[PDB]
Design an enzyme around this catalytic site. Sequence first.
Site, short mmCIF file in Angstrom:
data_model
loop_
_atom_site.label_atom_id
_atom_site.label_comp_id
_atom_site.label_asym_id
_atom_site.label_seq_id
_atom_site.Cartn_x
_atom_site.Cartn_y
_atom_site.Cartn_z
N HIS A 129 -10.78 -39.05 -5.13
CA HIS A 129 -10.58 -40.51 -5.14
C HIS A 129 -10.08 -41.08 -3.80
O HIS A 129 -9.91 -42.29 -3.69
CB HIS A 129 -9.71 -40.96 -6.31
CG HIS A 129 -8.25 -40.66 -6.18
ND1 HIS A 129 -7.64 -39.71 -6.97
CD2 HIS A 129 -7.30 -41.28 -5.44
CE1 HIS A 129 -6.36 -39.74 -6.65
NE2 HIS A 129 -6.11 -40.68 -5.73
N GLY A 166 0.46 -42.94 -2.88
CA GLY A 166 0.44 -42.15 -1.66
C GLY A 166 0.76 -40.68 -1.89
O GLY A 166 0.45 -39.84 -1.04
N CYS A 212 -0.65 -38.68 -4.06
CA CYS A 212 -1.84 -37.93 -4.45
C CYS A 212 -2.20 -36.89 -3.42
O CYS A 212 -2.02 -37.11 -2.23
CB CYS A 212 -3.02 -38.85 -4.75
SG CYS A 212 -2.63 -40.18 -5.93
C1 LIG Z 1 0.30 -45.17 -8.19
C2 LIG Z 1 0.54 -43.69 -8.34
C3 LIG Z 1 1.82 -43.20 -8.61
C4 LIG Z 1 2.00 -41.86 -8.85
N1 LIG Z 1 1.00 -40.97 -8.87
C5 LIG Z 1 -0.23 -41.41 -8.59
C6 LIG Z 1 -0.51 -42.75 -8.31
N2 LIG Z 1 -1.83 -43.18 -8.03
C7 LIG Z 1 -2.77 -43.41 -8.97
O1 LIG Z 1 -2.59 -43.17 -10.16
C8 LIG Z 1 -4.09 -43.96 -8.45
C9 LIG Z 1 -4.02 -45.47 -8.17
C10 LIG Z 1 -5.21 -43.58 -9.42
C11 LIG Z 1 -5.63 -44.41 -10.44
N3 LIG Z 1 -6.57 -44.09 -11.34
C12 LIG Z 1 -7.13 -42.88 -11.26
C13 LIG Z 1 -6.79 -41.99 -10.24
CL1 LIG Z 1 -7.57 -40.43 -10.11
C14 LIG Z 1 -5.82 -42.33 -9.32
#
Ligand SMILES: Cc1ccncc1NC(=O)[C@H](C)c1cncc(Cl)c1
Lengths: 304, 304
Positions: A41, A143, A145
Site C-alpha cells: 500500500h 507512518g 507501516c
Molecule cells: C493510521 C495507522 C495507524 C496505525 N497503524 C497503521 C495505520 N495506517 C493505516 O491503517 C493505513 C491508512 C491503511 C488503511 N487501510 C488499509 C491499509 Cl493496508 C492501511
Amino acid sequence: SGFRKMAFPSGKVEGCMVQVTCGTTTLNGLWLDDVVYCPRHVICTSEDMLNPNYEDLLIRKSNHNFLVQAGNVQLRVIGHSMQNCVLKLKVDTANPKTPKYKFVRIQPGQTFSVLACYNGSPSGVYQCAMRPNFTIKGSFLNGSCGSVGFNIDYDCVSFCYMHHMELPTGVHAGTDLEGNFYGPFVDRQTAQAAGTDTTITVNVLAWLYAAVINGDRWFLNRFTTTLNDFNLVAMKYNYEPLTQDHVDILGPLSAQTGIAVLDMCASLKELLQNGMNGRTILGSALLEDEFTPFDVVRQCSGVT
Amino acid sequence: SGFRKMAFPSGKVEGCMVQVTCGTTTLNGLWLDDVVYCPRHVICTSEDMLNPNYEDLLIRKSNHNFLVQAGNVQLRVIGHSMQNCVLKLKVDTANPKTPKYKFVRIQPGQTFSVLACYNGSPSGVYQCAMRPNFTIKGSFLNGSCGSVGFNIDYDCVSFCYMHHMELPTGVHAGTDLEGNFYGPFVDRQTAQAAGTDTTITVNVLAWLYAAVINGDRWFLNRFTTTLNDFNLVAMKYNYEPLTQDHVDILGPLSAQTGIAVLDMCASLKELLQNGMNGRTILGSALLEDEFTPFDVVRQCSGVT
Ligand SMILES: Cc1ccncc1NC(=O)[C@H](C)c1cncc(Cl)c1
Ligand SMILES: Cc1ccncc1NC(=O)[C@H](C)c1cncc(Cl)c1
C-alpha cells in the site's frame, strides 16, 4: 528475581530499517541482502486505499518511483515485484548489516517483539502476541507501516510480522514477510471487524508458573482438575481450549516447580471463577497471556 | 492507536556490552571510548561480598587480572581505577561502536530502558522506572550485574543506571555511571530493606491522559478537585504528593485532550476511592505509574 514483559534486543533489526517513499506516501521497509520488503500500500494514495487494484496501480510504477533511503543514503532500485501484500524492491547493494535471518509464519498465541519505526527510524521496541483472532494489540500511528515483528534465536532473526493497518477498533493487522495477512484482513480502507479475542490459556499458565518461580504463590490451591473439566471453565471465560500439546509444552515449568499442569489449571479455574480479590500476580491485577512457556523458560534462565 | 510499555531501541547499547571477568567472577561491562565501566564487586568472591573492603581487595588486583571480552575478542587493559562503586578499566582500543553518550543521574519517578545482559551478551530489553524508594522492579538473575539503564534523545544515549544487586525482597538496586548508588544501598551482601514504594502520581496522570487519547474514557467524571484536596487522597493511598511542577509537565497532555489537570486529578481521586470495578484502562486492571508525561507525548506523537 522479577518478571518483565521483555522484548528481544532490537539492534539486528534496527540495522535493517529503511524508509520507502512512493509518490507522496512514506512508510518503513526492511532491507535484507539486496531486497527491501515493504507493505504494497506504499503505492497508494489515501483515495486509492478505499478500493485499490494493486496490480493496476503497480503498472504505473517504475523502479525509479520507489525511493529507498537507509539512514541518510539513497539505495538504487534495480527491480520491483509484488508478493501477496508486500513489495520486494531489489536494490543494487546488499545490506552490510544483514543479520542471519529467516521468514516465519507464526501461530496465534505466539509472541514476538515489534520495532516500531517512522520514516525508517526506530522509535521503540515492545513485546506483542499474535491474538487468536489474528490481530495484534500494538502501538502504531500513521507512518508505522512496514515496522516488523521478530524473534531471535542466538544470532538468527526470525521475522514474523510486518505492520500494514489499524482496524477501526484500534487493533492492528498485518502480514508475514511473504505478504500473507494473518487473519482474514485485506489491505483496504474498509471496515473489517475482528472476531472474538480469546485468552491464550497456555500462556496464562506459563505466566502462573513464572509467578510461582518468582515468589507470588497466593493463588496456589488445594485442588486439581481434568482437561475436560478445565475446558468447560475455559469456554465460559473465552479462554482457548487447552490440549495435551499445551500440557506437553508446560512440562519444563511443571518439572522446575513441582506443580503438576492440571493442579495449575485448577488454580487458574478458581482465579477465573473468583477473580483476584483485589490482589496482584507479578504486579498485574489481571491474568497476563502474552508470555509463552518458551518466554518464561528463557527469562527465568537468562538465555542470551 | 494503542499504548504499550515501550523501550528505546537497544542497538546503540548492545554495541557497548562486554564481558568482564575478575578471578572467578564474571559480569557485564559497558565499553564507551577506551573505558570499560563495571560494578566494582567483580573483584569479589561470594565470601568477600559479606563484608568487603574494596580498597584492600583492589590492591591485590593488576590490569592483567581484569579480562575484558567484546563479543569474541579480548581487550587489553592498560589502566584500572575505582570511582565510587564502579570500576573503570582503561583499554587500549576505543569502542568503534561508541554512540553519542552522556552519564545522567535520574530522579525517582523517571523511566528508562534496561538492556539485561549475561556474559556480555544481551538477552532482552524492558522499560523500568526508578521507584521513589530508589529501587527498580527489574528482571535480573545472577550474572546480570553491569547491565545498564538508559534513555535516548535522537542519537544521544543517556546512561542512567548500572545494575549491582538484588535485595532479599527481589527488587533491584544499582548505581548511576559514576558509581553512586541510587538510594541508601551499599554493595554488600547484607540485608538492606527498602522503604515505602509510593505510586508515581504524575506518571499515573500521564497514563490517564494516554488512555483518553486512545479511547479509554469510562473513568472521566463530572468532578474537579484542588492540589491540596487531591494530596489528602494521594497521602492515604501512598501516592506521591502532586506539585505545580507536576501540573506544569502535564500541560501538553491537558492541552491536547482539553481536560484540565485538576479534573484528571478528580478522575484519579475517584479511581483511588472506588477502584476500577472490574474494568480496565489501556488493558490494565491497575493504575500504571511507569510512563512519564514525556513518555506519553513521545509515544502518542511517534518521536524517533
Ligand atoms: C493510521 C495507522 C495507524 C496505525 N497503524 C497503521 C495505520 N495506517 C493505516 O491503517 C493505513 C491508512 C491503511 C488503511 N487501510 C488499509 C491499509 Cl493496508 C492501511
Ligand atoms: C543474584 C542476583 C540477581 C539479580 N541481580 C543481581 C544479583 N546479584 C547480586 O545481588 C550479588 C550476589 C550481590 C550481592 N550483594 C551485593 C552486591 Cl553489590 C551484589
